[PDB]
Amino acid sequence: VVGGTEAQRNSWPSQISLQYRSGSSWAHTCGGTLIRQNWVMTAAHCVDRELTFRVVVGEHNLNQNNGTEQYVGVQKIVVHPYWNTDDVAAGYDIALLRLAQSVTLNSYVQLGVLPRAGTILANNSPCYITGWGLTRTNGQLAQTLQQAYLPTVDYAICSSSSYWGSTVKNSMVCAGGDGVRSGCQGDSGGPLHCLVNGQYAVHGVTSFVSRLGCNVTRKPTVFTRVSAYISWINNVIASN
Ligand SMILES: CC(C)C[C@H](NC(=O)C(F)(F)F)C(=O)N[N@@+](C)(CC(=O)Nc1ccc(C(C)C)cc1)Cc1ccccc1
Ligand SMILES: [Ca+2]
């Protein structure tokens, strides 16, 4: 997250860190959202490489024991059928990970609230992006969870030629674009939390930023719109 501030410990308890084994250790590659005790939602581009993955819930500092972490293996990866690695601008950047076991819920570990199907937010709705990704374009990962206030940019503005044009589809949510605050590499897969009816719900899965830079004026961060995928998500959980 560029232009973020540090989050409080139990502020975003559905946030997970998706990690892969790197030699002897484990490195953070992506965020995600805990949606069931044994299911995690993330971006499909996070699992394009065939690596050994684990999920960490109840995480706050990547490099220090917090006394709250649970570490569990990924047993099955279900990527959306239409995902195409060579065309992220086509959409379908979503994947569901079945965990090797059920995590224990507590004040640090809670399920993410999904929106009802078809829900579109109005322009400039209040949303927060969260993650441990790069804090500057070509910088380094955050050690502690960051958050940034990232209000939405509706589809008619986001797909206008001065913003992303044709590259954004209506199956995506755009948030930010002020040139200060954005998602950045390593925030991929994570939540965009938006306040709707007094409740924060996860409306986005972080998908891409400009190749020119993470915080670029009129290139808001782009998210998979979770409300476009509610039937697919429920059909995978109920059949697997
Ligand atoms: C791996 C891809 C699928 C998504 C990748 N995701 C992220 O970094 C995210 F923001 F979500 F956390 C991204 O935007 N990667 N970039 C590598 C940018 C990139 O390639 N983005 C991109 C944008 C649009 C498209 C469409 C037009 C095909 C493809 C890739 C990040 C970047 C940002 C600033 C400076 C340098 C690098
Ligand atoms: Ca830790």
Euclidean distance between CA atoms 23 and 80, whole angstroms: 29
173 and 237, same structural domain? no
133 and 88, same structural domain? no
222 and 124, same structural domain? yes
- The bridge status of strand 191-196 relative to strand 127-131 is antiparallel
Kindly list the catalytic residues: 45, 93, 188
**Contact (Cβ atoms closer than 8 angstroms) between residue 80 and residue 161:** no
Q: Give the CATH number, domain containing residue 7.
A: 2.40.10.10
**Contact (Cβ atoms closer than 8 angstroms) between residue 177 and residue 148:** no
35 and 88, same structural domain? yes
Residue 196 pairs in a beta bridge with: 199
Q: What burial class does residue 128 get, using C-beta atoms within 10 Å of its C-beta: 0-12 exposed, 13-18 middle, 19+ buried?
A: buried
Which of 208, 212, 214 should be mutated for ligand 1, with most atoms under 8 A from CB? 208
Which of 188, 209, 217 should be mutated for ligand 1, with most atoms under 8 A from CB? 209
Residue whose CA is closest, atom 2 of ligand 1?
208
Q: Residues 99, 88, 195, CA angle at the centre, nearest 5°? A: 65
145 and 218, same structural domain? yes
Three-class HEC string of the chain = CECCEECCCCCCCCEEEEEEEECCEEEEEEEEEEEECCEEEECHHHHCCCCCEEEEECCCECCCCCCCCEEEEEEEEEECCCCCCCCHHHCCCCEEEEECCCCCCCCCCCCCCCCCCCCCCCCCCCEEEEECCECCCCCCECCECEEEECCEECHHHHCCCCCCHHHCCCCEEEECCCCCCECCCCCCCCEEEEEECCEEEEEEEEEECECCECCECCECEEEEEHHHCHHHHHHHHHHC
Mark residue 48 as left, alpha or beta (left: phi above 0; alpha: psi -120 to 50; beta: remaining): alpha
**Contact (Cβ atoms closer than 8 angstroms) between residue 143 and residue 174:** no
Distances (CA, A) of 44 to 34, 49, 63, 205, 208: 15, 10, 26, 10, 12
Solved by what technique?
A: X-ray
**Contact (Cβ atoms closer than 8 angstroms) between residue 165 and residue 156:** no
Atom of ligand 1 at shortest range from CA of 183: 10
Residue whose CA is closest, atom 35 of ligand 1?
213
Atom of ligand 1 at shortest range from CA of 43: 11
Residue whose CA is closest, atom 20 of ligand 1?
211
1 and 120, same structural domain? yes
Give the closest ligand to the alpha carbon of residue 70. Answer: 2
Atom of ligand 1 at shortest range from CA of 131: 12
**Contact (Cβ atoms closer than 8 angstroms) between residue 98 and residue 42:** no
Residue 166: phi and psi, rounded to 5, are -55, -25
By C-alpha distance, which of 184, 182, 173 is closest to 217? 182
Euclidean distance between CA atoms 32 and 85, whole angstroms: 19
Residue 73: phi and psi, rounded to 5, are -80, 155
185 and 172, same structural domain? yes
**Please, which residues have CB within 8 angstroms of residue 117's CB and are 6 or more apart in sequence?**
227, 228, 230, 231
Count CA atoms within 13 Å of residue 34 on its CB side. 27
Q: Which two tokens stand for residue 186?
A: 């390593």
Q: What burial class does residue 199 get, using C-beta atoms within 10 Å of its C-beta: 0-12 exposed, 13-18 middle, 19+ buried?
A: exposed
Residue 81's domain comprises 13-111+228-240
191 and 118, same structural domain? yes
**Contact (Cβ atoms closer than 8 angstroms) between residue 20 and residue 44:** no
CA 122 centroid distance within chain: 20
**Please, which residues have CB within 8 angstroms of residue 161's CB and are 6 or more apart in sequence?**
none
Number of separate domains in the chain: 2
Residue whose CA is closest, atom 29 of ligand 1?
88
Instruction: Give me the resolution in angstroms, 1 decimal.
Output: 1.8
Q: Residues 28, 143, 149, CA angle at the centre, nearest 5°? A: 95
Cα-to-centroid distance, 220 and ligand 1 (Å): 12
Which of 88, 93, 192 should be mutated for ligand 1, with most atoms under 8 A from CB? 88
Q: Which residues line ligand 1 (CB under 6 A)?
A: 45, 88-89, 133, 137, 167, 183-185, 187-188, 206-211, 213-214
**Contact (Cβ atoms closer than 8 angstroms) between residue 46 and residue 30:** yes
Q: What burial class does residue 60 get, using C-beta atoms within 10 Å of its C-beta: 0-12 exposed, 13-18 middle, 19+ buried?
A: buried
| The one-letter amino acid at 26 | W
116 and 8, same structural domain? yes
Atom of ligand 1 at shortest range from CA of 221: 10
161 and 49, same structural domain? no
76 and 145, same structural domain? no
By C-alpha distance, which of 229, 235, 124 is closest to 172? 229
Euclidean distance between CA atoms 128 and 44, whole angstroms: 21
129 and 94, same structural domain? no
Euclidean distance between CA atoms 182 and 148, whole angstroms: 7
